[PDB]
Amino acid sequence: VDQATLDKLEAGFKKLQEASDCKSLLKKHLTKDVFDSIKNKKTGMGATLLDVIQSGVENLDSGVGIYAPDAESYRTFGPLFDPIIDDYHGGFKLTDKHPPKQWGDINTLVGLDPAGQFIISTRVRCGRSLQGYPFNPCLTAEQYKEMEEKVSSTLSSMEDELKGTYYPLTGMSKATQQQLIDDHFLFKEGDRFLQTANACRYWPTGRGIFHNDAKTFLVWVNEEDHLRIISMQKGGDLKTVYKRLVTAVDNIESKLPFSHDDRFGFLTFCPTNLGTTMRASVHIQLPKLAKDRKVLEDIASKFNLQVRGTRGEHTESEGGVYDISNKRRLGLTEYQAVREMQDGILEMIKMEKAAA
Ligand SMILES: Nc1ncnc2c1ncn2[C@@H]1O[C@H](COP(=O)(O)OP(=O)(O)O)[C@@H](O)[C@H]1O
Numbered sequence: 199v200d201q202a203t204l205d206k207l208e209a210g211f212k213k214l215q216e217a218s219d220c221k222s223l224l225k226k227h228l229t230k231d232v233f234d235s236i237k238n239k240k241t242g243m244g245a246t247l248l249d250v251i252q253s254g255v256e257n258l259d260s261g262v263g264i265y266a267p268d269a270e271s272y273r274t275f276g277p278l279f280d281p282i283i284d285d286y287h288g289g290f291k292l293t294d295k296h297p298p299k300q301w302g303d304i305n306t307l308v309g310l311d312p313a314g315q316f317i318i319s320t321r322v323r324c325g326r327s328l329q330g331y332p333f334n335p336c337l338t339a340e341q342y343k344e345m346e347e348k349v350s351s352t353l354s355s356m357e358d359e360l361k362g363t364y365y366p367l368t369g370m371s372k373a374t375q376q377q378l379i380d381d382h383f384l385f386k387e388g389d390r391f392l393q394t395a396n397a398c399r400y401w402p403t404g405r406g407i408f409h410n411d412a413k414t415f416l417v418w419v420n421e422e423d424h425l426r427i428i429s430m431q432k433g434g435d436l437k438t439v440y441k442r443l444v445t446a447v448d449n450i451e452s453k454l455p456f457s458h459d460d461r462f463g464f465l466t467f468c469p470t471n472l473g474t475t476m477r478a479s480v481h482i483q484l485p486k487l488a489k490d491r492k493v494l495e496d497i498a499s500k501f502n503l504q505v506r507g508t509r510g511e512h513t514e515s516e517g518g519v520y521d522i523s524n525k526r527r528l529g530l531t532e533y534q535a536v537r538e539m540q541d542g543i544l545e546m547i548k549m550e551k552a553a554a
């Protein structure tokens with residue numbers, strides 16, 4: 199680690215210390231003790247602590263504030279990742295290991311809103327990383343295209359319901375891009391947290407989206423993660439959505455080699471996405487409980503749920519519509535993760551009916 203990087207690290211650490219109202223996990227867990235132990239370390243690909251923490255230093259409103267430039271980073275800079283991971287995922291000890299993949303018994307899932315008065319739409323996603331490829335900040339332009347090629351070529355082999363077409367972001371019209379985003383299908387452009395993590399180089403090269411014609415099955419290519427595998431539809435039929443996601447992931451896994459870790463499960467660019475990599479969410483209205491989103495979030499948190507805006511994280515609710523999902527992804531199975539969303543949402547609905 200060259201002096202120039204150390205200076206910036208020392209300066210970044212200071213900025214974090216001074217931010218009295220900063221509430222990031224980065225600030226909370228990057229103590230003086232922790233910092234000194236790992237600030238001089240570097241990975242085989244040349245990733246430093248600066249690469250890890252830089253997004254959180256520049257964006258003080260971060261909830262987490264760190265990313266892994268490569269797989270090695272999770273251990274090289276373990277003393278920072280470990281406590282942050284433990285905090286976010288609601289408990290994960292040094293001696294803990296993420297459990298084996300287990301979708302569980304899908305038929306044990308129930309109807310979340312038969313009368314259709316609360317839930318607008320349901321979505322479940324997972325993420326995967328390709329073996330032999332580092333995370334965004336270490337990729338070259340050429341690497342983005344190979345990955346784009348391999349993944350797009352693989353998904354052309356999807357069959358039946360999952361059969362679809364790959365649409366590169368390159369060549370996609372501005373009008374078309376915005377419509378896909380407004381409809382909650384395509385990842386947004388220009389995320390300040392990712393940019394400062396050097397996750398958006400060469401944009402939009404290598405980026406795109408695969409989906410079936412109904413747009414119930416989608417794959418994001420080369421956004422935050424190499425792949426995001428997505429099932430979603432209008433209404434509240436979580437059972438169908440989850441079953442479709444499983445089918446897709448199982449088929450894709452048989453074709454593409456993904457990075458998996460004995461302790462951290464499936465690897466992702468952000469530590470919040472480790473393990474199951476699963477985020478099961480609904481777009482839901484809860485007018486009595488939502489009359490102050492800060493109250494809503496407090497209710498959600500006790501159920502291990504996270505609240506996001508209608509257009510995703512870092513956005514406001516529109517028309518009283520909130521995105522509510524399981525927060526935890528690591529140290530629990532896929533089934534347990536999806537059940538936490540189900541169970542929490544079922545209870546929040548119970549509370550909504552009982553509310554004044
Ligand atoms: N339950 C849902 N129903 C409909 N659209 C959703 C749902 N959950 C997320 N989305 C959409 O997915 C897109 C990705 O947003 P993010 O909040 O970044 O999710 P991810 O876990 O996919 O990174 C956003 O446009 C958001 O509208």
Ligand SMILES: NC(=[NH2+])NCCC[C@@H](N)C(=O)O
Nearest residue numbers: 260261262263391422468470
């Ligand atoms: N990985 C992801 N898409 N969201 C998790 C939080 C990201 C981090 N930049 C933050 O502190 O917002």
Ligand SMILES: [Mg+2]
Nearest residue numbers: 385422510511
């Ligand atoms: Mg996202």
